[PDB]
Amino acid sequence: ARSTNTFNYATYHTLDEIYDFMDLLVAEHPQLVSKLQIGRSYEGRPIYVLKFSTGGSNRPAIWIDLGIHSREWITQATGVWFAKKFTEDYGQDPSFTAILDSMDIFLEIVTNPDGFAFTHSQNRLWRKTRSVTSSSLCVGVDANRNWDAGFGKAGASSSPCSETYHGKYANSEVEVKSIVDFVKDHGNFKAFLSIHSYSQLLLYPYGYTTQSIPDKTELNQVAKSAVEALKSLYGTSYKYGSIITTIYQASGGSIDWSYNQGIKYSFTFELRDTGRYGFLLPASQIIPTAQETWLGVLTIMEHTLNN
Numbered sequence: 001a002r003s004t005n006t007f008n009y010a011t012y013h014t015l016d017e018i019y020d021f022m023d024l025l026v027a028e029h030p031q032l033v034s035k036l037q038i039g040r041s042y043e044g045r046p047i048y049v050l051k052f053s054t055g056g057s058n059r060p061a062i063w064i065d066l067g068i069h070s071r072e073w074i075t076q077a078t079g080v081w082f083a084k085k086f087t088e089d090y091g092q093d094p095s096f097t098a099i100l101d102s103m104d105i106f107l108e109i110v111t112n113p114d115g116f117a118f119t120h121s122q123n124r125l126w127r128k129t130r131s132v133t134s135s136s137l138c139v140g141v142d143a144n145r146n147w148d149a150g151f152g153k154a155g156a157s158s159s160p161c162s163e164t165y166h167g168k169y170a171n172s173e174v175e176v177k178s179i180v181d182f183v184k185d186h187g188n189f190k191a192f193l194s195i196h197s198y199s200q201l202l203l204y205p206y207g208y209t210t211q212s213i214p215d216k217t218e219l220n221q222v223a224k225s226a227v228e229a230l231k232s233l234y235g236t237s238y239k240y241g242s243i244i245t246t247i248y249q250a251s252g253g254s255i256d257w258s259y260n261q262g263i264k265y266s267f268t269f270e271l272r273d274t275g276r277y278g279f280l281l282p283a284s285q286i287i288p289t290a291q292e293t294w295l296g297v298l299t300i301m302e303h304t305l306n307n
């Protein structure tokens, strides 16, 4: 792909293709997009975030990350599509234009680059990072169990060989600490969205505790509105609710952490499907998934801009 206009959005790509895509995009829309390196992975690959902004100084922002679990390929694919869509819709879509005119969007397409490279080279279903666990033969940590939110409580495994291993301590994974430092340093994030697959769910906090968040009514109403928007295109049906009541008890998850930092609009999307293909969703479903997920995300952004 010589231009972001010739990149194939309807197929799954490797890490290099996605990193090359980032530079094409910046080159084409220098005034709107910037590439930031917020850290380096365990195996030393750069960790990149795309910043979409029309100016200002430390405008309130929206965080969106994809690919924290490497095998959920539909998420990195949706992230690439979103990056392109942002550049297409600014100045065309009134709603999206109003958002970018007042807020910045930070997009992390490949949150776990080492695991992503591993899914391409050796094990398509790899979920964790690739950090070497000292007193074990088992590699990696579930980066979505490593956050400082009920860290180590029920909903995570203490065994290094588990798919849900939480790691030695909160934020032990550089892929996680890189995000934590960046968001803490920025201090003006208003929304935090973390995308996964599969199950077709829209979740809000909490996963580590049965306690209800103080903003439950509002977040529930936003979730309802976002799922209605998403369903409007292809009829894809999503359920919504707090993590613990909807999926399962899970400790150390990112949105529990972000909400505890005061970032009210903290949500996780679990993309298509419901099990027919699961992690191996056909390339033919990439665009439809991305398009409908965009309506759900845009709904949340609109609420953020106004409240």
Ligand SMILES: O=C(O)[C@@H](O)Cc1ccccc1
Pocket: 144, 196, 203, 207, 243, 247, 250, 251, 252, 253, 254, 255, 256, 268, 270
């Ligand atoms: O097991 C997982 O990571 C997610 O799919 C569910 C989840 C989302 C957000 C926070 C905790 C858990």
Ligand SMILES: [Zn+2]
Pocket: 069, 072, 144, 196, 197
């Ligand atoms: Zn996941």
